[PDB]
Design an enzyme around this catalytic site. Structure first.
Site, PDB file in Angstrom:
ATOM      1  N   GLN A 105       0.867  -1.217   0.000  1.00 42.70           N
ATOM      2  CA  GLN A 105       0.000   0.000   0.000  1.00 42.70           C
ATOM      3  C   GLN A 105       0.894   1.256   0.000  1.00 42.70           C
ATOM      4  OE1 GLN A 105      -2.585   0.725   3.368  1.00 42.70           O
ATOM      5  NE2 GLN A 105      -4.103   1.675   2.027  1.00 42.70           N
ATOM      6  N   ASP A 108       2.422   1.634  -3.515  1.00 41.24           N
ATOM      7  CA  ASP A 108       1.312   2.113  -4.372  1.00 41.24           C
ATOM      8  C   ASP A 108       1.199   3.637  -4.207  1.00 41.24           C
ATOM      9  OD1 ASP A 108      -1.705   2.814  -4.657  1.00 41.24           O
ATOM     10  OD2 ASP A 108      -1.497   0.879  -5.709  1.00 41.24           O
ATOM     11  N   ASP A 110       3.277   5.842  -3.216  1.00 41.16           N
ATOM     12  CA  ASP A 110       4.455   6.531  -3.791  1.00 41.16           C
ATOM     13  C   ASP A 110       4.225   6.750  -5.297  1.00 41.16           C
ATOM     14  OD1 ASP A 110       7.151   7.221  -4.767  1.00 41.16           O
ATOM     15  OD2 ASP A 110       7.820   6.612  -2.755  1.00 41.16           O
ATOM     16  N   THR A 184       4.202  11.592  -8.194  1.00 49.91           N
ATOM     17  CA  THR A 184       5.337  11.321  -9.083  1.00 49.91           C
ATOM     18  C   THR A 184       5.393   9.815  -9.359  1.00 49.91           C
ATOM     19  OG1 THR A 184       6.962  10.938  -7.406  1.00 49.91           O
ATOM     20  CG2 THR A 184       6.642  13.263  -8.072  1.00 49.91           C
ATOM     21  N   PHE A 186       7.981   8.204 -10.181  1.00 47.64           N
ATOM     22  CA  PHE A 186       9.256   7.683  -9.632  1.00 47.64           C
ATOM     23  C   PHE A 186       9.011   7.144  -8.213  1.00 47.64           C
ATOM     24  CE2 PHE A 186      10.200  11.091 -12.673  1.00 47.64           C
ATOM     25  CZ  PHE A 186      10.776  10.331 -13.667  1.00 47.64           C
ATOM     26  N   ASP A 188      10.209   7.494  -5.140  1.00 48.89           N
ATOM     27  CA  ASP A 188      11.078   8.625  -4.704  1.00 48.89           C
ATOM     28  C   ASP A 188      10.719   9.189  -3.325  1.00 48.89           C
ATOM     29  OD1 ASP A 188       8.662   9.757  -5.471  1.00 48.89           O
ATOM     30  OD2 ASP A 188       9.556  11.269  -6.816  1.00 48.89           O
ATOM     31  N   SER A 190       7.798  10.232  -2.486  1.00 43.21           N
ATOM     32  CA  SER A 190       6.855  11.346  -2.697  1.00 43.21           C
ATOM     33  C   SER A 190       5.728  11.249  -1.657  1.00 43.21           C
ATOM     34  CB  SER A 190       6.372  11.433  -4.126  1.00 43.21           C
ATOM     35  OG  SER A 190       5.763  10.215  -4.585  1.00 43.21           O
ATOM     36  N   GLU A 258      -5.739   6.657   5.985  1.00 39.28           N
ATOM     37  CA  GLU A 258      -6.855   5.788   5.513  1.00 39.28           C
ATOM     38  C   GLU A 258      -7.017   4.573   6.432  1.00 39.28           C
ATOM     39  OE1 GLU A 258      -6.427   2.552   3.858  1.00 39.28           O
ATOM     40  OE2 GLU A 258      -8.543   2.299   3.283  1.00 39.28           O
ATOM     41  N   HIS A 351      -5.622  -5.680  -2.005  1.00 43.84           N
ATOM     42  CA  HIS A 351      -6.932  -5.588  -1.296  1.00 43.84           C
ATOM     43  C   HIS A 351      -7.429  -6.967  -0.849  1.00 43.84           C
ATOM     44  CE1 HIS A 351      -7.904  -1.613  -3.556  1.00 43.84           C
ATOM     45  NE2 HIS A 351      -7.017  -1.401  -2.563  1.00 43.84           N
TER      46      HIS A 351
HETATM   47  C1  HEM Z   1      -6.606  -1.662   4.734  1.00 39.86           C
HETATM   48  C2  HEM Z   1      -5.960  -1.465   3.591  1.00 39.86           C
HETATM   49  C3  HEM Z   1      -6.419  -0.711   2.414  1.00 39.86           C
HETATM   50  C4  HEM Z   1      -7.493   0.134   2.236  1.00 39.86           C
HETATM   51  C5  HEM Z   1      -8.446   0.561   3.340  1.00 39.86           C
HETATM   52  C6  HEM Z   1      -7.507   0.569   0.884  1.00 39.86           C
HETATM   53  C7  HEM Z   1      -8.468   1.464   0.354  1.00 39.86           C
HETATM   54  C8  HEM Z   1      -8.455   1.943  -0.987  1.00 39.86           C
HETATM   55  C9  HEM Z   1      -9.391   2.878  -1.555  1.00 39.86           C
HETATM   56  C10 HEM Z   1     -10.586   3.420  -0.832  1.00 39.86           C
HETATM   57  C11 HEM Z   1      -9.030   3.149  -2.835  1.00 39.86           C
HETATM   58  C12 HEM Z   1      -9.731   4.050  -3.838  1.00 39.86           C
HETATM   59  C13 HEM Z   1     -10.755   3.306  -4.640  1.00 39.86           C
HETATM   60  C14 HEM Z   1     -11.340   4.096  -5.803  1.00 39.86           C
HETATM   61  O1  HEM Z   1     -12.125   5.063  -5.575  1.00 39.86           O
HETATM   62  O2  HEM Z   1     -11.097   3.749  -6.990  1.00 39.86           O
HETATM   63  C15 HEM Z   1      -7.835   2.374  -3.041  1.00 39.86           C
HETATM   64  C16 HEM Z   1      -7.150   2.409  -4.224  1.00 39.86           C
HETATM   65  C17 HEM Z   1      -5.961   1.721  -4.393  1.00 39.86           C
HETATM   66  N1  HEM Z   1      -5.440   0.827  -3.569  1.00 39.86           N
HETATM   67 FE1  HEM Z   1      -6.072   0.226  -1.864  1.00 39.86          FE
HETATM   68  N2  HEM Z   1      -6.521  -0.062   0.182  1.00 39.86           N
HETATM   69  C18 HEM Z   1      -5.820  -0.824   1.071  1.00 39.86           C
HETATM   70  C19 HEM Z   1      -4.729  -1.624   0.805  1.00 39.86           C
HETATM   71  C20 HEM Z   1      -4.032  -1.614  -0.388  1.00 39.86           C
HETATM   72  C21 HEM Z   1      -2.910  -2.415  -0.656  1.00 39.86           C
HETATM   73  C22 HEM Z   1      -2.312  -3.399   0.351  1.00 39.86           C
HETATM   74  C23 HEM Z   1      -2.486  -2.074  -1.922  1.00 39.86           C
HETATM   75  C24 HEM Z   1      -1.350  -2.647  -2.673  1.00 39.86           C
HETATM   76  C25 HEM Z   1      -0.599  -3.696  -2.274  1.00 39.86           C
HETATM   77  C26 HEM Z   1      -3.410  -1.096  -2.413  1.00 39.86           C
HETATM   78  C27 HEM Z   1      -3.371  -0.487  -3.652  1.00 39.86           C
HETATM   79  C28 HEM Z   1      -4.299   0.435  -4.162  1.00 39.86           C
HETATM   80  C29 HEM Z   1      -4.101   1.127  -5.427  1.00 39.86           C
HETATM   81  C30 HEM Z   1      -2.986   1.042  -6.370  1.00 39.86           C
HETATM   82  C31 HEM Z   1      -5.123   1.942  -5.600  1.00 39.86           C
HETATM   83  C32 HEM Z   1      -5.309   2.894  -6.750  1.00 39.86           C
HETATM   84  C33 HEM Z   1      -4.517   4.183  -6.354  1.00 39.86           C
HETATM   85  C34 HEM Z   1      -4.574   5.225  -7.467  1.00 39.86           C
HETATM   86  O3  HEM Z   1      -5.536   6.038  -7.429  1.00 39.86           O
HETATM   87  O4  HEM Z   1      -3.696   5.314  -8.396  1.00 39.86           O
HETATM   88  N3  HEM Z   1      -4.341  -0.888  -1.488  1.00 39.86           N
HETATM   89  N4  HEM Z   1      -7.504   1.671  -1.922  1.00 39.86           N
HETATM   90  O1  NO2 Z   2      -5.725   4.507   0.349  1.00 41.06           O
HETATM   91  N1  NO2 Z   2      -6.777   4.874  -0.067  1.00 41.06           N
HETATM   92  O2  NO2 Z   2      -7.406   5.916  -0.117  1.00 41.06           O
HETATM   93 CA    CA Z   3       6.584   8.877  -6.318  1.00 42.88          CA
HETATM   94 NA    NA Z   4      -8.729   6.968   0.711  1.00 43.47          NA
END
Ligand code: HEM
Ligand code: NO2
Ligand code: CA
Ligand code: NA
Ligand SMILES: *[C@@H]1O[C@H](CO)[C@@H](O[C@@H]2O[C@H](CO)[C@@H](O)[C@H](O)[C@H]2NC(C)=O)[C@H](O)[C@H]1NC(C)=O
Ligand code: NAG
Ligand code: NAG
Ligand code: NAG
Ligand code: NA
Length: 595
Positions: A105, A108, A110, A184, A186, A188, A190, A258, A351
């Protein structure tokens, strides 16, 4: 592209071509194309966007518009039929610590953020979306299928707002819509320092010339720092307990509070900067604030890259690590460093690794207090349980001695995220991250499962029997095809995660290919990659080589018992050693006799 030069924030970017430091924005990394990988630009498109109108309208918007001759299923119905499960017994990963989930997370955050459309201003628009479930303009609500329990308790929908996009908004371009990456590309740090000048400056301690990050003035953890509070209202961290009145943390990334273990790792990273900035000042009493901030920053960026590429990616990609991320052969200025739109969904494999509970453990790694284990849903936007219930140390021990959830074709996403998610401004523990993921795939114009299989050189199943063979599961393939009448229509998030995991990895062949390519590019296309000659001295690199998460814990908490391999499942006391047995970051090679 259809029309280039539609990047409004492309200018005002000055490149000091001899600067030894990254910009905050990520501009000036690539010398020939200076916006590449910078924040507040379009996510890269590896494949043309797919929208029911070919431009911006998402599949599932128009009831009478098919995808390939079939209606796309409701996101929440896919969630209920395929993603959900009741029994948390037996669901944990026997060989991944909870840290494995949490580092995912952090990385991600970053790399990528696609902010929802900017409609914060109080408006009937929020009411039309949340109250009346009216689909229009940015409102693209997640409608409940027949017989959804939430119909009985929550009304007919979950509100959902479309992601922001590049180019002027009402004046949208005649190229297909591209969502923004607000951080970013990168790797990095951020998420610690920020991706914009305003925030980067607000986060800093400029009150003294020590190159420190600002720390909390209202609260401490046994003499160790907390991040500052975000003092803008309303605050979701206050909203979840109006008696405690403990706001969210302010960090380089807006999502830092979060959940409590994300806020935990942010606190460790912030602490490490100020520890590095203090140690740099001792070794170099001459250096000014700016140089102490930049040199600590560059060290922390290198730490994040090493933990990620040395410890984390190998136990995600397993057998596929070598095929997509072979040993570094140096900086390549032809490589696109940008995060792809598809990667933002592929990296949502974490997730399914989130388990249903978080534990606080004492110095003997036994339950801390009588509420030591808490349901995850109570810990969204929760800073009060850190500030008022024992600080970071008990949560850090939980990260080491508790396990990640294992992804399971029968048990994909815990009901803590699938039925009980809290979203800021929604004021209910009633949202579905899985349904949100699927709606967001469509919002972002994602090509379907078989387009990505093709992209990755993989078979494209056309039949029930073909899909059974690729998923190695008869019942899951039948349930997917009952909702999506063809594998061509399966949303990439659920298709990618449905595939059985590669040997020694935690994702299937399709995700290993999408993730593997993206991580290859962020390493190869980064001018400030730590192992790139000239970025660090050889002696700086022999030092950086011995970083570890266990060391970061030892140096920034009062946790004194850590494992050597913090990502594997570790049990106390057998797999734990004293901090004294863990390698240290020797900062002796940043000693600058500069006369
Ligand atoms: C308790 C843990 C976590 C919670 C509560 C959580 C919650 C969320 C929420 C609410 C979103 C936005 C959904 C949307 O509106 O599209 C999101 C997006 C995302 N989550 Fe999770 N997440 C968790 C764990 C993780 C983990 C462990 C990873 C990766 C290993 C991850 C990677 C992502 C990524 C890449 C996005 C898209 C971010 C972007 O906007 O570019 N999340 N997460
Ligand atoms: O990490 N989610 O907002
Ligand atoms: Ca970055
Ligand atoms: Na959030
Ligand atoms: C809101 O947070 C308060 C403040 O920490 C919580 O109460 C503390 O928690 C329990 C009482 O339930 C005691 O161990 C502490 O002594 C309490 N302190 C105070 C100031 O009351 C409270 O439980 C939280 N409420 C909710 C609903 O989450
Ligand atoms: C900034 O640093 C000074 C001196 O070290 C310290 O006393 C002060 O509390 C710091 N301010 C913030 C907001 O972190
Ligand atoms: C650099 O990247 C390009 C982009 O495709 C690749 O084809 C080329 O072989 C790479 N060269 C080196 C020396 O890394
Ligand atoms: C556990 O995972 C590690 C990598 O973190 C690996 O080297 C080790 O062999 C695995 N052990 C078992 C028992 O599967
Ligand atoms: Na700001």
């Amino acid at each position: 592209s259809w029309e280039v030069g539609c990047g409004a924030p492309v200018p005002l970017v000055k490149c000091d071509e001899n600067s030894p430091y990254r910009t905050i924005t990520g501009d000036c990394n690539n010398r020939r194309s200076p916006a590449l990988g910078a924040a507040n630009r379009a996510l890269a498109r590896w494949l043309p966007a797919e929208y029911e109108d070919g431009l911006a309208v998402p599949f599932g918007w128009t009831q009478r518009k098919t995808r390939n001759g079939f209606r796309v299923p409701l996101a929440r119905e896919v969630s209920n039929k395929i993603v959900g499960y009741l029994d948390e017994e037996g669901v944990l990963d026997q060989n991944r610590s909870l840290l494995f989930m949490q580092w995912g997370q952090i990385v991600d955050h970053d790399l990528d953020f696609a902010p929802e459309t900017e409609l914060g201003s109080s408006e009937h628009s929020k009411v039309q979306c949340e109250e009346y479930c009216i689909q229009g303009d940015n409102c693209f609500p997640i409608m409940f299928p027949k017989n959804d329990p939430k119909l009985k308790t929550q009304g007919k929908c979950m509100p959902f707002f479309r992601a922001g996009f590049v180019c002027p908004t009402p004046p949208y371009q005649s190229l297909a819509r591209d969502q923004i990456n607000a951080v970013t590309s990168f790797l990095d740090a951020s998420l610690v320092y920020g991706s914009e000048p305003s925030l980067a400056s607000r986060l800093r301690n400029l009150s003294s010339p020590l190159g420190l990050m600002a720390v909390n003035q209202e609260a401490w953890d046994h003499g160790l720092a907390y991040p500052p509070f975000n003092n803008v209202k309303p605050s979701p961290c206050e909203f979840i307990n109006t008696t405690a009145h403990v706001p969210c943390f302010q960090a380089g990334d807006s999502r830092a509070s979060e959940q409590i273990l994300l806020a935990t790792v942010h606190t460790l990273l912030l602490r490490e900067h100020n520890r590095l900035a203090r140690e740099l000042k001792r070794l170099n009493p001459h250096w000014d604030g700016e140089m102490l901030y930049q040199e600590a920053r560059k060290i922390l960026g290198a730490f994040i890259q090493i933990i990620t590429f040395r410890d984390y990616l190998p136990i995600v990609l397993g057998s596929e690590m070598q095929k997509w991320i072979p040993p570094y052969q140096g900086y390549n200025n032809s490589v696109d460093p940008r995060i792809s739109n598809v990667f933002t969904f592929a990296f949502r494999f974490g997730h399914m690794e989130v388990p249903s509970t978080v534990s606080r453990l004492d110095e003997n790694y036994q339950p801390w207090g009588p509420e030591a284990e808490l349901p995850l849903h109570t810990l969204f936007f929760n800073t009060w349980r850190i500030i008022k219930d024992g600080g970071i140390d008990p949560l850090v021990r939980g990260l080491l001695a508790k396990k990640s959830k294992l992804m399971n074709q029968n048990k994909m996403v815990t009901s803590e995220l699938r039925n009980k998610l809290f979203q800021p401004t929604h004021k209910i523990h009633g949202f579905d991250l899985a349904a949100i993921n699927l709606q967001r795939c469509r919002d972002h114009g994602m090509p379907g499962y078989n387009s990505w299989r093709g992209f990755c050189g993989l078979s494209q199943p056309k039949t029930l029997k073909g899909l059974q063979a690729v998923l190695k599961n008869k019942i899951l393939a039948k349930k997917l095809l009952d909702l999506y009448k063809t594998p061509d229509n399966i949303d990439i998030w659920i298709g990618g995660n449905a595939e059985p995991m590669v040997e020694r990895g935690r994702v299937g062949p399709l995700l290993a290919c999408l993730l593997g390519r993206q991580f290859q590019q962020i390493r190869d296309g980064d001018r400030f990659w730590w192992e790139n000659p000239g970025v660090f001295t050889e002696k700086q690199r022999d030092s950086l080589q011995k970083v570890s998460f266990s060391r970061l814990i030892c140096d920034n908490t009062h946790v004194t018992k850590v494992p050597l391999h913090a990502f594997q499942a570790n049990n106390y006391p057998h797999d734990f050693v004293d901090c004294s047995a863990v390698d240290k970051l020797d900062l002796s090679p940043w000693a600058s006799r500069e006369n």
